[PDB]
Design a protein around this motif. Structure first.
Motif, mmCIF file in Angstrom:
data_model
loop_
_atom_site.group_PDB
_atom_site.id
_atom_site.type_symbol
_atom_site.label_atom_id
_atom_site.label_comp_id
_atom_site.label_asym_id
_atom_site.label_seq_id
_atom_site.Cartn_x
_atom_site.Cartn_y
_atom_site.Cartn_z
ATOM 1 N N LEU A 32 0.614 -1.364 -0.261
ATOM 2 C CA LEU A 32 -0.077 0.026 0.056
ATOM 3 C C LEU A 32 1.047 1.423 0.088
ATOM 4 C CD1 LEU A 32 -2.909 -1.279 2.164
ATOM 5 C CD2 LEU A 32 -2.766 -1.290 -0.026
ATOM 6 N N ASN A 35 2.259 1.775 -3.527
ATOM 7 C CA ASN A 35 1.020 2.354 -4.322
ATOM 8 C C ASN A 35 1.179 3.774 -4.178
ATOM 9 O OD1 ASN A 35 0.556 -0.031 -5.382
ATOM 10 N ND2 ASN A 35 -1.687 -0.355 -4.706
ATOM 11 N N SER A 36 0.944 4.179 -2.625
ATOM 12 C CA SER A 36 0.956 5.573 -2.526
ATOM 13 C C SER A 36 2.411 6.420 -3.133
ATOM 14 C CB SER A 36 0.804 5.730 -0.988
ATOM 15 O OG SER A 36 -0.253 5.451 -0.439
ATOM 16 N N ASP A 38 4.293 5.686 -5.709
ATOM 17 C CA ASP A 38 3.850 5.617 -7.299
ATOM 18 C C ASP A 38 2.873 6.890 -7.503
ATOM 19 O OD1 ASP A 38 5.662 3.485 -7.410
ATOM 20 O OD2 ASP A 38 4.149 1.978 -7.989
ATOM 21 N N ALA A 39 1.830 6.808 -6.661
ATOM 22 C CA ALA A 39 1.002 8.113 -7.152
ATOM 23 C C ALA A 39 1.314 9.422 -6.703
ATOM 24 C CB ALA A 39 -0.511 7.851 -6.181
ATOM 25 N N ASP A 77 -2.593 9.153 1.387
ATOM 26 C CA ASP A 77 -1.588 10.023 0.410
ATOM 27 C C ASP A 77 -2.284 11.000 -0.288
ATOM 28 O OD1 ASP A 77 -2.135 9.110 -2.741
ATOM 29 O OD2 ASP A 77 -2.010 7.006 -1.844
ATOM 30 N N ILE A 80 -1.667 11.468 -7.053
ATOM 31 C CA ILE A 80 -2.546 11.869 -8.047
ATOM 32 C C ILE A 80 -4.113 11.685 -8.128
ATOM 33 C CG2 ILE A 80 -2.098 10.092 -9.666
ATOM 34 C CD1 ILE A 80 -1.713 12.414 -12.040
ATOM 35 N N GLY A 81 -4.611 10.538 -7.149
ATOM 36 C CA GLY A 81 -5.741 10.217 -7.089
ATOM 37 C C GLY A 81 -6.205 9.527 -8.230
ATOM 38 N N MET A 82 -7.559 8.704 -8.264
ATOM 39 C CA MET A 82 -8.223 7.874 -9.382
ATOM 40 C C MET A 82 -9.407 8.398 -9.659
ATOM 41 S SD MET A 82 -7.197 4.184 -7.959
ATOM 42 C CE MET A 82 -7.497 4.597 -6.191
ATOM 43 N N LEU A 91 -8.440 -0.060 -13.539
ATOM 44 C CA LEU A 91 -7.527 -1.053 -12.546
ATOM 45 C C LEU A 91 -7.961 -2.652 -12.701
ATOM 46 C CD1 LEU A 91 -8.696 0.573 -8.863
ATOM 47 C CD2 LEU A 91 -6.519 0.482 -9.932
ATOM 48 N N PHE A 122 -2.233 -4.051 -4.162
ATOM 49 C CA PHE A 122 -3.364 -3.839 -3.397
ATOM 50 C C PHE A 122 -3.954 -4.845 -2.673
ATOM 51 C CE2 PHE A 122 -7.800 -3.399 -3.064
ATOM 52 C CZ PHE A 122 -7.988 -2.246 -2.278
ATOM 53 N N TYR A 123 -4.289 -5.945 -3.910
ATOM 54 C CA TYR A 123 -5.066 -7.153 -3.141
ATOM 55 C C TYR A 123 -4.742 -7.789 -1.822
ATOM 56 C CZ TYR A 123 -7.571 -5.885 -7.310
ATOM 57 O OH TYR A 123 -8.187 -5.087 -8.509
ATOM 58 N N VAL A 134 -11.689 2.572 -0.401
ATOM 59 C CA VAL A 134 -11.068 3.443 -0.986
ATOM 60 C C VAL A 134 -11.656 4.580 -1.372
ATOM 61 C CG1 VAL A 134 -9.224 3.432 -3.067
ATOM 62 C CG2 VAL A 134 -9.593 1.366 -1.806
ATOM 63 N N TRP A 146 -14.945 3.552 -3.403
ATOM 64 C CA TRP A 146 -14.918 2.205 -3.818
ATOM 65 C C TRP A 146 -14.815 1.273 -2.731
ATOM 66 C CZ3 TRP A 146 -11.771 -1.994 -2.855
ATOM 67 C CH2 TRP A 146 -11.644 -3.213 -3.730
ATOM 68 N N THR A 168 -5.636 9.511 -2.290
ATOM 69 C CA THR A 168 -6.261 8.353 -2.102
ATOM 70 C C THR A 168 -6.108 7.849 -0.675
ATOM 71 O OG1 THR A 168 -5.813 7.789 -4.190
ATOM 72 C CG2 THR A 168 -6.235 6.002 -2.858
ATOM 73 N N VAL A 170 -6.758 4.765 1.766
ATOM 74 C CA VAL A 170 -7.212 3.183 1.942
ATOM 75 C C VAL A 170 -7.467 3.006 3.293
ATOM 76 C CG1 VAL A 170 -6.447 0.946 1.597
ATOM 77 C CG2 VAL A 170 -5.693 2.759 -0.250
HETATM 78 O O1 BA8 Z 1 -3.358 1.791 -2.704
HETATM 79 C C1 BA8 Z 1 -3.632 2.509 -3.614
HETATM 80 C C2 BA8 Z 1 -3.025 3.867 -3.526
HETATM 81 C C3 BA8 Z 1 -2.891 4.982 -4.545
HETATM 82 O O2 BA8 Z 1 -2.488 6.129 -4.403
HETATM 83 C C4 BA8 Z 1 -3.232 4.572 -5.874
HETATM 84 C C5 BA8 Z 1 -3.275 5.400 -6.896
HETATM 85 C C6 BA8 Z 1 -4.073 6.556 -7.215
HETATM 86 C C7 BA8 Z 1 -3.622 6.922 -8.643
HETATM 87 N N1 BA8 Z 1 -2.638 6.072 -9.005
HETATM 88 N N2 BA8 Z 1 -2.601 4.773 -8.189
HETATM 89 C C8 BA8 Z 1 -1.763 3.889 -7.989
HETATM 90 C C9 BA8 Z 1 -0.599 3.846 -7.790
HETATM 91 C C10 BA8 Z 1 0.207 2.611 -7.779
HETATM 92 C C11 BA8 Z 1 -0.263 1.498 -8.255
HETATM 93 C C12 BA8 Z 1 -1.665 1.293 -9.080
HETATM 94 C C13 BA8 Z 1 -2.197 2.655 -8.965
HETATM 95 CL CL1 BA8 Z 1 -3.853 2.796 -9.442
HETATM 96 C C14 BA8 Z 1 -3.834 3.219 -6.038
HETATM 97 C C15 BA8 Z 1 -4.074 2.428 -4.737
HETATM 98 C C16 BA8 Z 1 -4.499 1.040 -4.970
HETATM 99 C C17 BA8 Z 1 -5.888 1.016 -5.998
HETATM 100 C C18 BA8 Z 1 -6.609 -0.119 -6.166
HETATM 101 C C19 BA8 Z 1 -7.967 -0.258 -5.545
HETATM 102 C C20 BA8 Z 1 -9.139 -1.392 -5.715
HETATM 103 C C21 BA8 Z 1 -8.370 -2.354 -6.553
HETATM 104 C C22 BA8 Z 1 -6.984 -2.418 -7.072
HETATM 105 N N3 BA8 Z 1 -6.100 -1.302 -6.756
#
Ligand code: BA8
Length: 207
Positions: A32, A35-36, A38-39, A77, A80-82, A91, A122-123, A134, A146, A168, A170
């Motif tokens: 997680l 992911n943050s 990366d965004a 985080d 950029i958000g979704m 996704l 994420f899973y 989310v 979500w 975002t 979580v």
């Molecule tokens: O935990 C997260 C934190 C984040 O900031 C973001 C995010 C925002 C913009 N881009 N981005 C991103 C960053 C890295 C990799 C992929 C992504 Cl899409 C996404 C997720 C997980 C989203 C998720 C929800 C439900 C099922 C599957 N995946």
């Protein structure tokens, strides 16, 4: 509230994560945070050519918020958000290929900790959470929530809760036997072990 079916492959991945005996559950947090990070990299890169992309918030950070009363661990985080299309279509499209490659690696001898190398990290949240919510806000769209307790479906609704600006959140609704992930010393240990070199401030909130 709109209800969607997960694609069969993602539902299979979620059942595998929930059903497989695997003690090294702590890796969910690294996934997680990755992911943050990366965004946050994405919004930072975009702001280099368009500074107005930071009008929704200049601070680029990650907050870890445990709540013993709610039994939730929240990873926030200001990335950029979704958009809605990300949550419903994008996704899932990316996850289908990632899941297939991960499944094949698992059969070959890989373990659940390597999930992040397949872009479906994420899973791993389902190793410790019975439900994941989310909350996300992208500059080009509205704030959405979500949510999924697995079982083959997820929901998407417009979020009328406290506006977040951009990013975002979580929310991990932890399983009854996984409350160690609400403990300050436990979270500090995991961050130090797996996420020591993240290029953004990680603030662990106290209760
Ligand atoms: O935990 C997260 C934190 C984040 O900031 C973001 C995010 C925002 C913009 N881009 N981005 C991103 C960053 C890295 C990799 C992929 C992504 Cl899409 C996404 C997720 C997980 C989203 C998720 C929800 C439900 C099922 C599957 N995946």
């Amino acid at each position: 509230v709109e209800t969607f079916a997960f694609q069969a492959e993602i539902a299979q991945l979620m059942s595998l994560i929930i059903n497989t005996f695997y003690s090294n559950k702590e890796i969910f947090l690294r996934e997680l945070i990755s992911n943050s990070s990366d965004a946050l990299d994405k919004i930072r890169y975009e702001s280099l050519t368009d500074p107005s992309k930071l009008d929704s918030g200049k601070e680029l950070h990650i907050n870890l918020i445990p709540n013993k009363q709610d039994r939730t661990l929240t990873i926030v985080d200001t990335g950029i958000g979704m958009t809605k299309a990300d949550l419903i279509n994008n996704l899932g499209t990316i996850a289908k290929s990632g899941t297939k490659a991960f499944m094949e690696a698992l059969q070959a001898g890989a373990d659940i900790s390597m999930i992040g190398q397949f872009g479906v990290g994420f899973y791993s949240a389902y190793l410790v959470a019975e439900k994941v919510t989310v909350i996300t806000k992208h500059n080009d769209d509205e704030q959405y929530a979500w949510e999924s307790s697995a079982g083959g479906s997820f929901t998407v609704r417009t979020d009328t809760g406290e506006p977040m600006g951009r990013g975002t959140k979580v929310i991990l609704h932890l399983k009854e036997d996984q409350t160690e992930y609400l403990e300050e010393r436990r979270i500090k240990e995991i961050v130090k072990k797996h996420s020591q070199f993240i290029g953004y401030p990680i603030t662990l909130f106290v209760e």
